[PDB]
């Protein structure tokens, strides 16, 4: 009753399909591998953030909704915009950076100990230079006014987008924890799972927020509309809270074994 | 012919992605085990129906259609709440908890002897808890008046809503009993199934009923907003009555060893 | 290297997440493996029918669009009714009956011969039987007139229809054959591809024949309604040529042992 | 602790799902052979544009929108036709031809030695015939004028759709190369991701450009139109120099021997 594996077929098994963290132990700190991981991280958030980009400008193309209503087509757009464009963007570069693609991830897993601070500093830097030349990119690419800079909107207040922002984020970073860092038969589909929590995190926060959810994400924009608004540290804020409390309800589960019924 | 599997690759094949319910034996009625299983329902409940909550506040702010006309784009924005944020929170909890959510499918289990009753009772509380957290903090995150408690709607009777709510939670919970409880090479995967039946069962509810499918999301807001319709109980008795009707069916298959020809 | 599989882990290996039909061999004309199909088709296809039909009523609620146009939203949530209505109806019942919930697709398994003839007519029938009751109850719990019944629109003549319907429903038989027919690492995995396949089969065909590519799902709403368009033979024939286009497709490339290099 | 597989079940671990390409070594010259991958090539073409090119002409069939601007609803099922179509497509036939269905895949698969240049030249001959004979078929099965011929909108100059083509391929190319092409635990499920790449691509370029993205889906309609935009060339030299980024940036990584951190 044994598995019968044709030798041509081996690499599909043998070749685990995991986060490029997973694996980062003696020899990571090379030139080479710095390099690795942020050509992932690079890549991987430029195309993700110049598709969404993209695709919220022609959304924010929709007709005006009166007395401030909203637009559910256009906010399922917008979200799938992101929530899709992260979901590709991480399958890609998987193996080759992990694809955080979000400063606030990075943080929640070097909080983790999944990165180390060094590496992750040198991923969330890249990560916000990706999001300027993405925002530049879908900028130069599209015709009229930048559409896809955050801001408050729907009645919200600054507080209430902070709240909204960094649930959000811990919804998006547990999901990166509990599925990408924590080992099992479902790792290799976390790629999934992380692009439909970035799709929720948009239905809830794009109405009220713009939906930041990603340092790098709200920067690019905000640079090259040469605009910051006097609340752009919520898209600042609100992640870093979220990620920090992502990893401390992971945190608390770890020191639990959750797993595991009798330790 | 056989599988060559990287010692650092193990942990992908021997760490099982299956519900915690699975492997509550012997020793799982600590209280260490009592509180992860309430922490990740309360974790889960708490993200998945706080999401929706705001996801549906906001979808309820498009303008109002004429005539009680149904609004497709309003209707897939808020299954997508639901559907796709009890998705994330089941993958999320799924090895913590299992990823109930909802006291009905807690029900379904307890019947099936998937989960004790007691651990259900537990469970249920807990779930009802975090709905009551859910829909205060999703109030206090939204401006406006709560729009995300359940209401008869669409030309609806009572009795029309109740039998929508019970089929529509019996396809729920027919879902987890025959892809999570039923142990195969899906069950990793059931978390998506399950939140497309979630999706599919508010695409027939919300209209006409608001889409309880889940106590503990029919009695969180209604706590909330300090007002319960008469007709409150269709949420309660819809649910249970669909738990019981899945239950049935999935007994049903268990006496025919459905799975096996010869048995 | 070897894989090390804990022994309450086995079940999730050992037992296939596969097709009741590829295991049908010898013992399987028992009442008791008739019944088990049945049982099989009937819950899937009444779950399946009667959600979709619950959701379409919803959709034709919108306000008209004028000069016959169309409604992306509302095809939209039509689709997502059937399309995922079916993905959830086959991962129930995959290993039960596996899932066929269409006469049309039994046709195509009849004539690849992975369901002996006599078997086939048990489920077409129950298939049909099913959506009666799925089209009866599904009028019940709503309101007004029926509204998902199919019929000829969006300017489409019967030819039209007829060639819509074929094409429409030979993709949803060819994915059947391809995912689930065929034996491989994706089988499993067959009812997510068979659920999209539908959902595009829908979008393509909703407008122009309302998309019935399964003659129970547009005979039970036809009885219901009780009035029968006389180009009622369309969602028969378009379907039944459908499953021979997809049928000879995949007869075509078992004929030249596709899957091998080197036969 | 090892697995344990039933006979009857060994076609499932066996049997891998794996794209033709990965098997095309020694023997693939026959006619047999190119044979197979051109009718995998065909088909797969086929349906997919076929099935886009009538969901884009229902789409097109709702009412204007003023001023120029987005429907978002409408771009989303344009998107869905494509992105699920193109799923369901390579779904079918990955082990077939491999499911590249579009010429600009080939080009980017020849670069990187996956398919050899003759069989490439041949399987995208076959793309444009097939995407010919879907244009043809969609245009017969639908009323009025044709509405799914790629045409520059939305305010986009030439230049601005030439890149939107170019990033919007690259996007779809290097998700085949890195998914696909690359061989780990997920290339049996690299049809999904590709499926959901062109989703994004089509959120990103229909505005613009009409989402070409694929030589063989802007020729065809074009002859059915009997009708050559002279901007046409974007619909060549976009996708072509996508697939020549995308190449590149998998190259860079192969150099790299990215998924190793110690070579
Ligand atoms: C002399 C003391 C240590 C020698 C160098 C050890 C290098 C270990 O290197 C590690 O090997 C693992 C496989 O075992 C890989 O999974 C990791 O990617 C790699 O970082
Ligand atoms: C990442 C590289 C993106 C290059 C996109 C350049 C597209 C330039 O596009 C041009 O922009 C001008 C305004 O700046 C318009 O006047 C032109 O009509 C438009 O073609
Ligand atoms: C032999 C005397 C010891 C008495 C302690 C009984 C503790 C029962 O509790 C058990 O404790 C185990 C750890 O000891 C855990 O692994 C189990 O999960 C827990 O149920
Ligand atoms: C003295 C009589 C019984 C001794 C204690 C038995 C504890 C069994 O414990 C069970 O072990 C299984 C693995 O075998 C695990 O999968 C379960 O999670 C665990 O509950
Ligand atoms: C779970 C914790 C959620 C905290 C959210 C608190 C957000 C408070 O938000 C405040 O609410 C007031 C009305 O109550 C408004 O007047 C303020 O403008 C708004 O900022
Ligand atoms: C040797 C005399 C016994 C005659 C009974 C013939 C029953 C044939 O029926 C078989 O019965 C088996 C159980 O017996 C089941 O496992 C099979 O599914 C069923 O087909
Ligand atoms: C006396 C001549 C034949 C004896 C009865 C053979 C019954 C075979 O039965 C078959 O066994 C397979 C496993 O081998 C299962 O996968 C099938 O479900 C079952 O139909
Ligand atoms: C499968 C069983 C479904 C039972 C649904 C029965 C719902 C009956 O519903 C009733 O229908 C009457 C019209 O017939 C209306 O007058 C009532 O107001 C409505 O409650
Ligand atoms: C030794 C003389 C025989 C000459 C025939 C050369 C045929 C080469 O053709 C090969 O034929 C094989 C079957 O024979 C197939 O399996 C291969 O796919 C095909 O490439
Ligand atoms: C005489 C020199 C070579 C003899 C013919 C070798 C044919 C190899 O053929 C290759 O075999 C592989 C399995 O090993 C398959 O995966 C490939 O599909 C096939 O192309
Ligand atoms: C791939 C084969 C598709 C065949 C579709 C043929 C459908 C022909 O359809 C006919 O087209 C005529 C205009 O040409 C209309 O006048 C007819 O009313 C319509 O039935
Ligand atoms: C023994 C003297 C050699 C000194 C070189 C130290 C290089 C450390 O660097 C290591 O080089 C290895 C290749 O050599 C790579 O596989 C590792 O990824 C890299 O970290
Ligand atoms: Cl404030
Ligand atoms: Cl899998
Ligand atoms: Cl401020
Ligand atoms: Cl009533
Ligand atoms: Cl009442
Ligand atoms: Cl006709
Ligand atoms: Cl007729
Ligand atoms: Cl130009
Ligand atoms: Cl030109």
């Not at 993405?134 to 900028?139: E, Q």
């Amino acid at each position: 009753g044994q598995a019968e594996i044709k030798p041509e077929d081996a690499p599909y098994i043998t070749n685990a399909y995991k986060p490029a963290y997973a694996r980062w132990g003696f020899g990571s700190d090379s030139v080479r591998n710095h390099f690795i991981a942020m050509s992932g991280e690079f890549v991987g958030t430029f195309l993700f953030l110049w598709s969404a980009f993209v695709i919220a400008q022609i959304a924010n193309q929709a007709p005006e909704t009166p007395d401030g209503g909203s637009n559910p087509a256009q906010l399922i757009m917008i979200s799938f915009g992101f929530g899709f464009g992260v979901m590709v963007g991480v399958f890609i570069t998987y193996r080759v950076s992990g694809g955080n693609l979000n400063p606030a991830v990075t943080l929640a897993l070097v909080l983790a100990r999944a990165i180390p601070p060094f590496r992750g500093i040198l991923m969330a830097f890249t990560q916000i230079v990706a999001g300027m030349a993405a925002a530049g990119a879908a900028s130069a690419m599209t015709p009229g006014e930048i559409a896809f800079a955050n801001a408050l909107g729907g009645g919200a207040s600054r507080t209430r987008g902070l709240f909204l922002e960094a649930f959000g984020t811990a919804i998006l970073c547990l999901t990166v924890l509990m599925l990408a860092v924590e080992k099992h038969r479902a790792t290799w589909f976390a790629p999934f799972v992380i692009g439909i929590a970035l799709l929720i995190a948009h239905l809830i926060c794009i109405y009220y927020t713009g939906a930041g959810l990603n340092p790098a994400r709200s920067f690019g924009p905000a640079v090259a509309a040469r605009s910051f608004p006097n609340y752009h540290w919520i898209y600042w804020l609100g992640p870093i809270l979220g990620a920090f409390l992502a990893y401390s309800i992971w945190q608390m589960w770890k020191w639990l074994n959750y797993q595991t019924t009798n330790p």
